Amino acid sequence: MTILFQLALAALVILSFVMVIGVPVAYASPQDWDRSKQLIFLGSGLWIALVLVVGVLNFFVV
Amino acid sequence: KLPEAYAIFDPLVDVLPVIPVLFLALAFVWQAAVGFR
Amino acid sequence: GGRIPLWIVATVAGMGVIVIVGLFFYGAYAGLGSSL
């Protein structure tokens, strides 16, 4: 649990950092918009789920 | 203090509140990229 | 004479000035002149 929490949170952190860069770059890129639109939607979903997971696991490490 | 399980993310937390200032500075990098047109 | 774009040269030189100035503020709190 404590290790599981910490990777999950580290993963949120890392995903966040890739969203921060990726979403503006994608949105303002001329060509690659097909592959981009899907991932943005995918990353977004992963990001939301990861917030819930850290939220729930909080109660097991705290 | 942060709950112990979060201590690891402590130094990250120390630097976040500065991020808004970085947005103001970013506008100037961006405008320089486009020659202040 | 055009290779490295002026916006990068400015963002980089500007970050150097912040770092060196940030360092000077840190030193206000540590070592000589810190009142400790």
Partner: peptide
């Protein structure tokens, strides 16, 4: 402290990086 400086280095670079990534790609800046 090394952790703090690294964190602020990665966050610090995220901004210009984006601009650069768009400039290299001739993006909609």
């Amino acid at each position: 402290v090394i952790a703090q400086l690294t964190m602020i280095a990665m966050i610090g670079i995220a901004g210009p990086m984006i601009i650069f990534l768009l400039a290299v790609r001739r993006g909609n800046l």
